């Protein structure tokens, strides 16, 4: 009814896609790390590179 | 262009064929193409909800593109029914094949085949040879169901001539069914019975040559193969377009979703939607225009079926070279094959001829056929096969004195009543 925008439907076959037509997709997490990154060694260097 | 030929025309001269030859000719028509459908939501967005909410901003684009393809997908079955569903009852032939020496065993269903194909259908099904929210839908009739109708039409034609087309099938001995089809081409039925053994061999040999023709080369079947190829070609292109960037930074939608802020993503993704959607609109337009061409061919096949199988043609070269005698259908991938059977005049001789003959003042004309002379005797003859008979008051009619007709000639028109009255 929603797919045809009609409250009444005739005899036949009708296509549709709405119910989730693929099974349980879901996304989480990453590979791992060992330290905080060394930004302060550049950002608070005494004098920078040429 | 071709070989030149001055036709040896003169107002006193005619050529009449002294002999004839049966021919069989193959003809091949497309009838229905690969039924397809697309979930545009899935194709455009790869089931990203973010992208799906942008696709809502284009409104009823996706629904109408899916509607148009569903419309084509229905009429491919209807084309196939319009060609094959012309026989209302499934006839089948009795076991004994005494068709006066005609040998249909190549084109009848072969009991060895589990799908009930003829031998020559089982050549055709061998000479002829996608997955991302796109789909192919299978046809409403299986290839075995098509092979049943191309049995029923064939069994009806062998056993009952035109009659099963007009009304219920009425049996007739096959030699006589050819005799009336011969009168249909204006060659008098006595010519058939007086030559029957020669005729059945000229026919059986041509069926023999068709096995060779459709075994030895695929080259004729290209006309059906193209319908498979073009739909495979379009579907492969419609998929490869997903690699197009369309002026976004990537073809992989998950890149944009992972790397960017909504403000930038809702620019980038809207380029991808614009591109993919225009790519689909291109394919759907091609299928509408291609479907219109196949439907025109299906209606031509439906006509060929109703006129040249269920009947006899009086339309010159609608159904092969020669005058039309008969035709048979054979089922094939995406299409139909016709075997037309036709009469061809085969050995000329020249004759002197006249439009009329004058007797004792009376101008006589032939009731049918032509007045011809070998040089000394004057004969009536039927037009398309030489059969010289003496010109007489019962094969002629009279209109006026000699003088009116151009180029009239004199011979006695013999009068078959007279020797009886002489008794
Ligand atoms: C008419 O043409 C046919 C061939 O189209 C001739 O048929 C051959 O007839 C001879 C005997 O007369 C046989 O030895 C051959 O085997 C026949 N050929 C075939 C294909 O069957 C026929 O002779 C011709 N008839 C006339 C009167 O010219
Ligand atoms: C009808 O034609 C078929 C072939 O089209 C003939 O069948 C072959 O007959 C020979 C013996 O004459 C056998 O060695 C073959 O194995 C047969 N082939 C098949 C496919 O059956 C058949 O003999 C012909 N019949 C008539 C009455 O003419
Ligand atoms: C025209 O046809 C007639 C009939 O076939 C030919 O006349 C016959 O010729 C044979 C010898 O070949 C004779 O035995 C018959 O008595 C003849 N019949 C008649 C009615 O005369 C005639 O020779 C042919 N003429 C030409 C020029 O071919
Ligand atoms: C057919 O036969 C008649 C005679 O039976 C021929 O008629 C003669 O024709 C010439 C020339 O026109 C006239 O001078 C004569 O007076 C005609 N005789 C009669 C009795 O009418 C006629 O020429 C013949 N025609 C052909 C085509 O052979
Ligand atoms: C750099 O030095 C400033 C003070 O000069 C300090 O506030 C800041 O936290 C330092 N940042 C890093 C990344 O070392
Ligand atoms: C028929 O007769 C004409 C007379 O001029 C001749 O030119 C022609 O070659 C002949 N044709 C055949 C097939 O004998
Ligand atoms: C027949 O045609 C020839 C030329 O081919 C001509 O000389 C002759 O007069 C014509 N005769 C008739 C009766 O038309």
Alpha-carbon gap, residue B126 to B123, rounded angstroms: 5
Task: Return the percent helix, strand and coil in chain A, to nearest 5.
Answer: 10, 0, 90
Distance (angstroms) between ligand 5 centre and the Cα of A41 equals 10
A43 lines ligand 5 (CB under 6 A): yes
Q: Do B70 and A25 touch (CB under 8 A)?
A: no
Contact (CB, 8 A) for B246 and B256: no
Q: At what angle do helices B143-160 and B174-184 cross, to 10 degrees?
A: 80
Query: Does B37 lie at the interface with A, CB-CB under 8 angstroms?
Result: yes
- Nearest CA to CA, how far is B174 from chain A (Å)? 46
Distance (angstroms) between ligand 3 centre and the Cα of B353 equals 17
Alpha-carbon gap, residue B305 to B150, rounded angstroms: 11
Nearest CA in chain B to A14: B70
- Nearest CA to CA, how far is B295 from chain A (Å)? 23
Alpha-carbon gap, residue B132 to B145, rounded angstroms: 31
Chain B residues in contact with A15 (beta carbon < 8 A): 37, 66, 70
Task: Name residues whose C-beta falls within 8 Å of residue B380's C-beta, 6 or more positions apart in sequence.
Answer: B366, B369, B370, B371, B372, B388, B389, B390, B391, B395, B396
Contact (CB, 8 A) for B382 and B186: yes
- Nearest CA to CA, how far is B40 from chain A (Å)? 10
For B112-164, give the secondary structure using H, E and C: CCCCCCECCHHHHHHHCCCCCCEEECCCCCCHHHHHHHHHHHHHHHHHHCCHH
Of A15, A17, A25, the CB nearest to B42: A17
Specify the 3-state DSSP secondary structure of B208: helix
Question: What stretch of H or E contains B275?
Answer: helix B262-304
Report the residue of A13, A21, A22, A23 to disrupt the B interface, i.e. the one with the largest count of B CBs within 10 Å. Answer: A21
Alpha-carbon gap, residue B149 to B91, rounded angstroms: 9
**Pairing outcome for strands B20-30 and B389-390:** unpaired
Alpha-carbon gap, residue B314 to B316, rounded angstroms: 6
Among all chains, which residue has been given the structure tokens 């397809």? B36
Alpha-carbon gap, residue B198 to B284, rounded angstroms: 56
- Method underlying the structure: cryo-EM
Distances (CA, A) of A2 to A7, A8, A36, B53, B208: 8, 10, 53, 18, 60
Quoted resolution (Å): 3.9
- Nearest CA to CA, how far is A34 from chain B (Å)? 23
* CA-nearest residue, atom 8 of ligand 6: B8
Nearest CA in chain A to B258: A27
Of B37, B42, B66, the CB nearest to A21: B42
Angle at B303 between CA B300 and CA B306, to 5 degrees: 155
Distances (CA, A) of B323 to B22, B187, B315: 10, 10, 9
Chain A residues in contact with B59 (beta carbon < 8 A): none
The binding-site residues of ligand 2, defined as CB within 6 angstroms of any ligand atom, are B 103, 105-106
Contact (CB, 8 A) for B159 and B173: no
Q: How many C-beta atoms lie closer than 10 Å to residue B284's C-beta? A: 20
Specify the 3-state DSSP secondary structure of B422: coil
């Amino acid at each position: 009814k929603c797919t045809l925008k009609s409250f009444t439907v005739e005899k036949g076959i009708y296509q549709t896609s709405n119910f989730r037509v693929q099974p349980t997709e879901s996304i989480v997490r990453f590979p791992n790390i060992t330290n905080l990154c060394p930004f302060g060694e550049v950002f608070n260097a005494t004098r920078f590179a040429s | 262009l071709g070989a030149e030929n001055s036709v040896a025309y003169s107002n006193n001269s005619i050529a009449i064929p002294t002999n004839f030859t049966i021919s069989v000719t193959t003809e091949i028509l497309p009838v229905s193409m690969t039924k397809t459908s697309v979930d545009c939501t899935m194709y455009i967005c790869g089931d990203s909800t973010e992208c799906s909410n942008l696709l809502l901003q284009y409104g009823s684009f996706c629904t109408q593109l899916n509607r148009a393809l569903t419309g084509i997908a229905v009429e491919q079955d209807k084309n196939t029914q319009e060609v094959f569903a012309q026989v209302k009852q499934i006839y089948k032939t009795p076991p004994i094949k005494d068709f006066g020496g005609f040998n249909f065993s190549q084109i009848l269903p072969d009991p060895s085949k589990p799908s009930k194909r003829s031998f020559i259908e089982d050549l055709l099904f061998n000479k002829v040879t996608k997955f991302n929210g796109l789909t192919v839908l299978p046809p409403l009739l299986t290839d075995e169901m098509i092979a049943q109708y191309t049995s029923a039409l064939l069994a009806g034609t062998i056993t009952s001539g035109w009659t099963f087309g007009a009304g219920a099938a009425l049996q007739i001995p096959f030699a006589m069914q050819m005799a009336y089809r011969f009168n249909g081409i204006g060659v008098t039925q006595n010519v058939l019975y007086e030559n029957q053994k020669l005729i059945a061999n000229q026919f059986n040999s041509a069926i023999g040559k068709i096995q060779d023709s459709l075994s030895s080369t695929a080259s004729a079947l290209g006309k059906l193969q193209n319908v498979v190829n073009q739909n495979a070609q379009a579907l492969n292109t419609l998929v490869k377009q997903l690699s197009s960037n369309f002026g976004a930074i990537s073809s992989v939608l998950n890149d944009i979703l992972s790397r960017l802020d909504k403000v930038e993503a809702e620019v980038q993704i809207d380029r991808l939607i614009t591109g993919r959607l225009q790519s689909l609109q291109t394919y759907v337009t091609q299928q509408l225009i291609r479907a219109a061409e196949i439907r025109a061919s299906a209606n031509l096949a439906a006509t060929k079926m109703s006129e040249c199988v269920l009947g006899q043609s009086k339309r010159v070269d609608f159904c092969g070279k020669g005058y039309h005698l008969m035709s048979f259908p054979q089922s094939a991938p995406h299409g139909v094959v016709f075997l037309h059977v036709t009469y061809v005049p085969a050995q000329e001789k020249n004759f002197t001829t006249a439009p009329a003959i004058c007797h004792d003042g009376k101008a006589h004309f032939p009731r049918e056929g032509v007045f011809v002379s070998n040089g000394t005797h004057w004969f009536v003859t039927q037009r398309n096969f030489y059969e010289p008979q003496i010109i007489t008051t019962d094969n002629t009619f009279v209109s006026g004195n000699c003088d009116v007709v151009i180029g009239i000639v004199n011979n006695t028109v013999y009068d078959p009543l007279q020797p009886e009255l002489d008794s």
